[model samples]
Target: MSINSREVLAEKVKNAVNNQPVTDMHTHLFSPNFGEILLWDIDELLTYHYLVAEVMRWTDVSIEAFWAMSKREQADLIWEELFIKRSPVSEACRGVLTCLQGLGLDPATRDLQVYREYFAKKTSEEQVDTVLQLANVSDVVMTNDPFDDNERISWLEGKQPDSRFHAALRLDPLLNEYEQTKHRLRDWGYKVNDEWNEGSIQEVKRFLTDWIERMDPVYMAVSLPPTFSFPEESNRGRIIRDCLLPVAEKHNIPFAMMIGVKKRVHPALGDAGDFVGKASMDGVEHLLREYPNNKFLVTMLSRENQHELVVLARKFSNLMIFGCWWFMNNPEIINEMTRMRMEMLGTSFIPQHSDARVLEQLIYKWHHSKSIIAEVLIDKYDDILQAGWEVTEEEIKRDVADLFSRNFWRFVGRNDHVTS
Candidate 1:
């Protein structure tokens, strides 16, 4: 029963965790049908938010100038400064190379010519297969915003379904900042106002229902601000309770709440400039308390929020804390959050999400997450074995597989069984 050296158990657990495939709980990925958002190639990889941050440090390119440039131009600049002119030492910079090489491309190329040439021959469907296969991701949930004209058209036109792609209704507009999307909603023929009145609430519900039938989402999600709190008199809070909550309850889909994104840390850099802020656990607790029967997939952007989230999960069967998202996706943060989550929530909490906006990003995101998760599991199993509890390799593998994919599936209430 007692495995003497923690290192002995460490290797076994690491292997078990690494080999298992994952069902990515959330992503910004799009299928071949939605060609508009299905980005791949070296340019996209280099220009990703992570590398975008790094490239700035290496060069004097103003964010305004960078954003104004074509995507290719921005990527060209990053490749020259980060990879050619300087060492690609940062994790973000390295991740791009990891992704490139994983997909059988040369990361060392100073010119984007090699990538564009290779990827040019491949179609979106082909790239999708290659990326998903390399990533070993069983399924990927797309951030489907009905407000986006391209996405709406994809659903309305009854685009051919891609089996690997699942949908999640992304309602950041209704959650974090309502006024920003109010005019868009108004133009979409919804009868609503600035206030969360009965008419506006009802109109929102109609919109949700209309899109629910179209998207058939497994879950509905929103990226909330740090100020997010339920049971408050704010228009967004009122909309969540009066409009969104009822639809989710009726549909039997989980509600995924990602908190702590401040949208733009630097206005010049656009989304690349986004930053994290502290989230309120009081609000999370409120939603969990109010909707005992509903499933909640929760992820917090701020590192300070992780421990509190897992602690909160201990008190609610309907709540599932998931993923070290955005800024929290790095190794140290993931390792810490994963270890703490397993300690408090066991394998009930989901460990990772690809969150890959570009198709190729899936490869490196999963590669990194799997390695970090393995290390965390190894350390835990080392402790377990030291306590003289025997764990079979088969059992460990099963748990590893569950942590990757099945856990998220069950938490989202995927099948016949009720979550509560």
Candidate 2:
């Protein structure tokens, strides 16, 4: 069909949204150089966070027993229980189907062995392009941690990373847990004292410099726990205000705050068991106020924080809100939060990030998100038209481009870095 044939607002908006290349601002996915433990197999896909949560409803697999089983065994159980036995109607289950379809495999094929065989045939690098193309994503920003020995060694080994894969320094271990951060810094040959003294402060700058030059992150990131308070005087807060903020300023990159995870609520469930809680609005208010020069890419995991956070964004130029994240990634929540952000912040905010741990997850995560985003944008454009505003295809395209990539790169001061 010709582009002009179906000129409906919904189709126009969806075409605008889907056709734009995504700069996924946050994802746990890494380049294959990182290691094989970052599993993207059918077994791993079947036991993903959503599937892990879903598998519990249909089976007698206790959390302890589930933890005891090998990943493949756990996946086999989920495949049999949810996909084969129960209807694969849930978003997560359907996501697996979408991924299969994207790979040119039959989603209707219930055989796990076939899927495994198909995946095993291709190398990780071979599949990366396929998944990214299927997801319509141009770039994926990995959550890199200098603190993690595995990641640290990978970068240190200087294995050439994929150009499509970008970096964001994940500072959770440093900011969230201080003593340990100091210990780890010292172990890594930094002079960080008990309370981050002078040499520590100097070395922190050097550390940031070394890594910033090496990894060349779009942003420096930290995930704060629920009880996080960002007063100007706290040691951790001082690290942000004094040590890190200045370094971020020097590098000209935003320091991202992903707040309100109440970590391991169900410890036996491991990574899948992590949950969110409401966070303080005023803490964000204070940081945005104090760091006028620093751009802060902020996202709250809690639904309750949504209204207040956007209100904060509206109040501060330094704040750029992004992604519904974790529990809020569902359609109902995404639609609500996205429309709410558009109403409050217009096209300034990023509405979604894959947060996809596995590489194939980019398929369903972006596909589902794009559908809901299009639905929201369709109504938004119609509302604009009803209000007597004229719309154009170019305008629609520009808006989608800004939302997906331009706004993010501009915020992080990296628009010149990649043509993609």
TM-score for each candidate, following the candidate numbering: 0.92, 0.94
Candidate 2: Cα lDDT at 103 = 78
lDDT of each: 0.81, 0.84
lDDT of 1 by residue, 266-298 (tens): 776666788889977998898899888788889
Worst 10 residues of 2 by lDDT: 1-10
lDDT of 2 at 288: 84
Q: Would you give me the overall lDDT of model 2?
A: 0.84
lDDT score at residue 338, model 2, on the 0-100 scale:
91
